From Swiss-Prot, chains A, B:
It comes from Homo sapiens. GO terms for molecular function: ATP binding; dTMP kinase activity; nucleoside diphosphate kinase activity. The modification N6-acetyllysine is found at K167. Pathway: Pyrimidine metabolism; dTTP biosynthesis. Its cofactor is Mg(2+). Catalyzes the phosphorylation of thymidine monophosphate (dTMP) to thymidine diphosphate (dTDP), the immediate precursor for the DNA building block dTTP, with ATP as the preferred phosphoryl donor in the presence of Mg(2+). Changing A97T: In CONPM; uncertain significance. Homodimer. This is Thymidylate kinase. Disulfide bonds: none annotated. Residues 131-155 are annotated as: LID.
């Protein structure tokens, strides 16, 4: 039975990860694929609620602790991720380990290596789309939110970490010009995703960063 | 101001970590030291309650997730640990990262290296006492508990991991013959601890596994 593809959406702030993720799943399903949407953090579990309270500033969490919770929040979904992929279901994921590393990695005294370790071993995405957008363009999309990390300076330190992670040639990274309209960005992502489901899947699901 | 020492108690099942830890703190205080007791897991925080529900079998948790929570449960106490040590308070800890690695490391497909990473960077113990006890002797102390991991076969796989961790010469490991009476074991630990508070402290607090 042909496994599903694991597709991740990553990208700068307001670049359209959530919009594009919901649109990709809808369009794959409409074209007869079996596809479902996931996102991280997944706030409905016990850990997810801790992470949600942190991001909304309702609680403060030690930085190493919070990093590990974010990763744990991925590991708790691995049994489901692996089962859905083995059943032929393509999974479109709004943020994954890349955000985990880039966001803690933007903080002082957090090496990229330390930030990567908790996630080593996770299911490896068959495709990692990185939605790029210029600052001037992200502004036309509205004001920063009120949640933690939604600050220009901090966003720019996360972006440098993302660019380090993209030097990683074990991953099938694809850049997406997220400045275009919602529809045009969607068509670019869609075609890339059809291609990943079609080919990328003839190899077994890999393991991230190992 | 002379910093406190960070002293960890590790050891096989029923070897006396908790008894010896409470006795050491009492005796250091009685001899005019400033000393306080900590333990891991620390079940009173939000994470600690998750860990307590897991150990008591009231909930099941994915293995990588549970490993990261156990480490996060240490990181959330680092601000306090560092502040108490800088104030001259010696901290006696009932289990630390060594248990974290040995217990997940006893499970299938968990390399010691992966298990160590979440804890890299923690405050480094000035002294790690390992209470050794033969199986036949641990039995005279009563029956296994009902909690997760309290099984002869699993305990023996954790012990092999502990022996790998003791090959680590960056740590001041001391073996303790925990087969003696409660008092005699206590006198051995006490003398070792006075020595660690006295000398081991003239160097800054280190960082574990780095
Ligand atoms: N290509 C696009 N062009 C214009 N506006 C967009 C585009 N993609 C998303 N938006 C809008 O920008 C805001 C951010 O989109 P969202 O998908 O929530 O981004 P993210 O999840 O990356 O933060 C929303 O108002 C959304 O409608
Ligand atoms: N040296 C010792 N000799 C005999 N019994 C002991 C000794 N140390 C502890 N005990 C008993 O063994 C049991 C386990 O002790 P405990 O300190 O809770 O061990 P741990 O925390 O290592 O599991 C308790 O009943 C305790 O009184
Ligand atoms: C998945 C993940 C997200 N995050 C962050 C990125 C976002 N903060 N900002 N901007 C935040 C919320 O996600 P959304 O933007 O997808 O709603 O969590 C982490 O810090 N670590 C992680 O492992
Ligand atoms: C500190 C720590 C303890 N543990 C385990 C060891 C013990 N299980 N058994 N036996 C358990 C409970 O601790 P006590 O024996 O100290 O009450 O948690 C971990 O699995 N990981 C950790 O990081
Ligand atoms: Mg979003
Ligand atoms: Mg390494
Ligand atoms: Mg105990």
């Amino acid at each position: 039975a042909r496994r599903g593809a694991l597709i991740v959406l990553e990208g700068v702030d307001r670049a359209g990860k959530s919009t594009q993720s919901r649109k990709l799943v809808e369009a794959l399903c409409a074209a007869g694929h079996r596809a479902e949407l996931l996102r991280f953090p997944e706030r409905s579990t016990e850990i997810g609620k801790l992470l949600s309270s942190y991001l909304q500033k309702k609680s403060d969490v030690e930085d190493h602790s919070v990093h590990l919770l974010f990763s744990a929040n991925r590991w708790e979904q691995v049994p489901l991720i692996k089962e859905k992929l083995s059943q032929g279901v393509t999974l479109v994921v709004d943020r994954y380990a890349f955000s985990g590393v880039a966001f803690t990695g933007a903080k002082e005294n957090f090496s990229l290596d330390w930030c990567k370790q908790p996630d080593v071993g996770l299911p490896k995405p068959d495709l990692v789309l990185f939605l790029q957008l210029q600052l001037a363009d992200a502004a036309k999309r509205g004001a920063f939110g009120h949640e933690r990390y939604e600050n220009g300076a901090f966003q720019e330190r996360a972006l440098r970490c993302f660019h380090q992670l993209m030097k990683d040639t074990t991953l099938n990274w694809k850049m997406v010009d997220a400045s275009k309209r919602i529809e045009a960005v969607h068509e670019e992502i869609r075609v890339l995703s059809e291609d990943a489901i079609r080919t990328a899947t003839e190899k077994p699901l890999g393991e991230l960063w190992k």
